[PDB]
Amino acid sequence: SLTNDERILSWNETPSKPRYTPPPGAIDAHCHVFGPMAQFPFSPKAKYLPRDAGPDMLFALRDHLGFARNVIVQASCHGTDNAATLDAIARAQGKARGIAVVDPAIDEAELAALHEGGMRGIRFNFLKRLVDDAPKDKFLEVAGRLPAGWHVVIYFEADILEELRPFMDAIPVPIVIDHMGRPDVRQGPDGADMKAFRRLLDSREDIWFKATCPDRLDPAGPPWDDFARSVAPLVADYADRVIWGTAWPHPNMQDAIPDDGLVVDMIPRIAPTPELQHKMLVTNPMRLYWSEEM
Numbered sequence: 231s232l233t234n235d236e237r238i239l240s241w242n243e244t245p246s247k248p249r250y251t252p253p254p255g256a257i258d259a260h261c262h263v264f265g266p267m268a269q270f271p272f273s274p275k276a277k278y279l280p281r282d283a284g285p286d287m288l289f290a291l292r293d294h295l296g297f298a299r300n301v302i303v304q305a306s307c308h309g310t311d312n313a314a315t316l317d318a319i320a321r322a323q324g325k326a327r328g329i330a331v332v333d334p335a336i337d338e339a340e341l342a343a344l345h346e347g348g349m350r351g352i353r354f355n356f357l358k359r360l361v362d363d364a365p366k367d368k369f370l371e372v373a374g375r376l377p378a379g380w381h382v383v384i385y386f387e388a389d390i391l392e393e394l395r396p397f398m399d400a401i402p403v404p405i406v407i408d409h410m411g412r413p414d415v416r417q418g419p420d421g422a423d424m425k426a427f428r429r430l431l432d433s434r435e436d437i438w439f440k441a442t443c444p445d446r447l448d449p450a451g452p453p454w455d456d457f458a459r460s461v462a463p464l465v466a467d468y469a470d471r472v473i474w475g476t477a478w479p480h481p482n483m484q485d486a487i488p489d490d491g492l493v494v495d496m497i498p499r500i501a502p503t504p505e506l507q508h509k510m511l512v513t514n515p516m517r518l519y520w521s522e523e524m
């Protein structure tokens with residue numbers, strides 16, 4: 231254990247109110263909880279030790295920004311121990327669903343227990359700066375024995391997309407891509423990375439993506455105009471396959487801490503019409519995470 235003070239703050243403690251008002255039932259489909267470490271320790275394999283960011287803080291943020299629901303995504307700092315994430319879902323009293331990280335050896339019963347606890351998929355992280363090992367064969371095997379209706383969430387960088395194509399084509403359930411596979415948004419909406427990512431989207435009908443993280447992808451900083459110009463055409467072209475999230479509490483972003491109000495204000499830039507906003511924030515995430523309500 232490290233004290234909270236000793237650990238890394240990566241979020242804005244007093245974020246601006248967004249100028250944009252999200253519609254009723256809006257889902258922040260990419261967020262995390264960290265600890266609280268006193269009850270839920272970090273993984274021995276964690277590559278960062280963040281400050282506590284618990285459910286009460288997450289819900290306060292959710293309310294402040296005007297969102298109705300969250301998808302709480304197991305963070306790499308907690309490894310395959312989903313306890314913190316599971317506790318947050320429990321505390322959300324129905325307003326949250328989850329994504330887990332699992333030992334590929336996890337048994338049928340343990341997966342069932344994760345489903346009851348509100349998980350609707352598992353995450354595969356191909357960023358070496360976050361996770362050392364990524365056994366594709368084992369990943370494929372676990373993906374083939376998930377509870378009915380689960381998907382897989384995949385996080386990778388643009389420079390390994392081509393290498394990952396055979397793996398992704400073999401995944402036997404739907405796929406959600408974190409942060410569009412980190413394209414270089416400086417290139418424009420028809421740049422090399424976006425062309426490659428579109429080839430991936432065009433290969434299977436059931437690949438969804440998060441149109442997220444201008445803070446991570448656009449080194450100019452706010453208003454992140456390159457992200458806006460490069461991402462908006464992608465949203466428009468794949469309107470039925472796009473979801474969105476804040477990425478709060480922004481692990482690893484301590485050197486460029488984003489204002490969540492500004493993060494939310496990207497929404498009407500990449501989704502300029504009411505219909506696009508409703509698809510990205512309500513209809514699409516509902517089909518993935520609350521299909522029983524659709």
Ligand SMILES: O=C(O)/C=C(\C=C(/O)C(=O)O)C(=O)O
Nearest residue numbers: 304305306307360477481482
């Ligand atoms: O969580 C994200 O969306 C982004 C990052 C962190 C993780 O993926 C994680 O630790 O689980 C990152 O890019 O550092």
